[PDB]
Subunit: 389 residues, 2 copies
């Protein structure tokens, strides 16, 4: 009696998933990178490790990060000596910080995105929350539903322990949710806090130490939907095609474990080398079908894992130096905010394009690419189209 084909046709959306709003937020405590070595070696009781401090100073000087925003403060660290040691039982204390801070910072970013969107929050049908800092049941998706006053029947997707490529992951997921469901409006929130990874220095663990020079806190929120209401909603970028892959010869490049001592970061291979060796294949998969071969003719968003990934990709492809400008600006002002970074870069790019009177939100260009890099070695690819003005 009942027609499923009629239901399916009536249930789905028509057009491409579109980013309709972007909002960001960071902890209030601003930490300058120029004075970080001294602050970090003092608060971790490591001032006597002069040679290790010199190695950390070089890591900070090479980071291309001017400052980072941190939930952790001198006061909080003085109350948590176990967090200041390289390896002490401290997950409960860290979890108590991030179970609250992740949704707190996420709400700030989400309220800003909802304000830009300008539509009733009761029209948000799906919620994607992504974090690599802490886990809990009910999760941060339930907390944000409560904190934002979303409908109780919002459809939630709680992405925990994702890693640095997950800015691409949440876009890949939001695309399918928006495109398959007529009327769907997806609130996407990436919120990353370094309280679960902060730890003291160890001269036999230099891989762990590099994380201390790079990771910073931040949240970004998006509204994503298909079939925008003309002259009411305002498209910023459209998603057109996505991919995720595991690079060959990359096993163990980035291994991150959640233990009693918190989240521990282990590095085993040349990440910049692997990314730059495999980025061209990811570009031809994405762009050959569109007839695009000139990689300077598209706008660029790349996860700034570190500056060497950016430099090596730029050199490999012969990208003009300006291609990575928005990416490098976010790295310089905020450091590596894990999954949230690429969403901050989208916001920077569209705001600079607008401010500077370019013709599209993607630096005056039509087509663009967003890349996420992280554990596995995983590469996420999202092909974007800009919007006029």
């Amino acid at each position: 009696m009942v027609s499923v084909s009629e239901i399916r046709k009536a249930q789905r959306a028509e057009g491409p998933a579109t980013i309709l709003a972007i909002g960001t937020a960071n902890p209030a405590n601003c930490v300058e990178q120029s004075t970080y070595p001294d602050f970090y070696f003092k608060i971790t009781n490591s001032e006597h490790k002069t040679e290790l401090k010199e190695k950390f100073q070089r890591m900070c000087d090479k980071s291309m990060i001017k400052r980072r925003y941190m939930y952790l403060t001198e006061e909080i660290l003085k109350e948590n000596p176990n967090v200041c040691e390289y390896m002490a039982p401290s997950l409960d204390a860290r979890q108590d910080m991030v179970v609250v801070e992740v949704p707190r910072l996420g709400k700030e970013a989400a309220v800003k995105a909802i304000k830009e969107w300008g539509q009733p929050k009761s029209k948000i049908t799906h919620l994607i929350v992504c974090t690599t800092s802490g886990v809990d049941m009910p999760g941060a998706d339930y907390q944000l539903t409560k904190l934002l006053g979303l409908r109780p029947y919002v459809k939630r997707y709680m992405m925990y322990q994702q890693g640095c490529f997950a800015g691409g992951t949440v876009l890949r997921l939001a695309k399918d949710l928006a495109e398959n469901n007529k009327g769907a409006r997806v609130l996407v929130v990436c919120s990353e806090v370094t309280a679960v990874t902060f730890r003291g220095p160890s001269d036999t663990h230099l891989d762990s130490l590099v994380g201390q020079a790079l990771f910073g806190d931040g949240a970004a929120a998006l509204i994503v939907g298909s079939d925008p209401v003309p002259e009411i909603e305002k498209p910023i970028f459209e998603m057109v095609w996505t991919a995720q892959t595991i690079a060959p010869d990359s096993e163990g490049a980035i291994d991150v474990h959640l233990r009693e001592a918190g989240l521990t970061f282990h590095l085993l291979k040349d990440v910049p080398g692997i990314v730059s060796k495999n980025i061209t294949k990811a570009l031809v998969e994405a762009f050959e079908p569109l007839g695009i071969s000139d990689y300077n003719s598209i706008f660029w968003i790349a996860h700034p894992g570190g500056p060497a990934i950016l430099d090596q990709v730029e050199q490999k492809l012969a990208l003009k130096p300006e291609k990575m400008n928005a990416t490098r600006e976010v790295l310089s002002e905020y450091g590596n905010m894990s999954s949230a970074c690429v969403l901050f870069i989208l916001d920077e790019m569209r705001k600079k394009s607008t401010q500077n009177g370019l013709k599209t939100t993607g630096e005056g260009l039509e087509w663009g690419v967003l890349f996420g890099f992280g554990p596995g070695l995983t590469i996420e690819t999202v092909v974007l189209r800009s919007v006029a003005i």
Copy 2:
């Protein structure tokens, strides 16, 4: 130049997401319920707690579980006294078990589902992995890709720390992935291991103790896709509509935290009561649009959190006793395997329907419902259509 509408039309699927294969697996160690109180009170050094053992015996007697399969054995527990205590630092030992066992068990279920499906594992485009048992980076999704030899470009969705309603969640997610992407074939794996939640008994924490009578291990895998190739692929169930909601007046009903002592299960409200009070609303949302109001006229799959949820739902709606038969058979043979449970119940239902020559895979009925229940209080609803024969 490039038409995004053309791309979008060529990129999406046409028909409803369909379950094309189901495979399950459990650890080899079979644990009888009749004698579990003695086993559990001996291994946890609690044999002198006579009254508490009595309370546990009653929980096991009322559980309606005959046996469970568990990775944990007497030998593994004797080597891990911190896991045998009610509350001792033990997450590292538990993670070392589950980071391996979750993908191992998932692999066995996935291989079974792929064998039934019959098509090359190179045609699997998307992979959803769900567990409430441990977390790691790269996740269990990466581990399964490697273990099964899936393509490196399989698109992965790692659902960690989800909870007992996530059998519904993975179906809700797989539906959009399959329907929005032409040719997509989604391998869905739920794999749950009780090594992160096992702990000793405490007479002031009877809510934790209830979990020790109910939780068991298991993995279930599905192949989901739209547009099945007729007579090559074999549809089992179709998904038609989904929902997720948070029941009113249920805050804190089920809070589960991942701490240095592992995963701790708490209960603060009457779950059977909340579920039975809110199930009608969930049914009307799903079935009023289809013109169905007789809930005995549809086939049923309910997460068997405990037998009281089933009994109270049955009594509330006046379901005939036979409606919950497949659900109760899975509870009897395997216990509560968290997210995997509802997928085992789909398997039992279609296998008994096919074995017994009923007219459809849903007990000879056309329309059916699958419910997941868990933290938040969250209710997941999936509306299914059976397949002839």
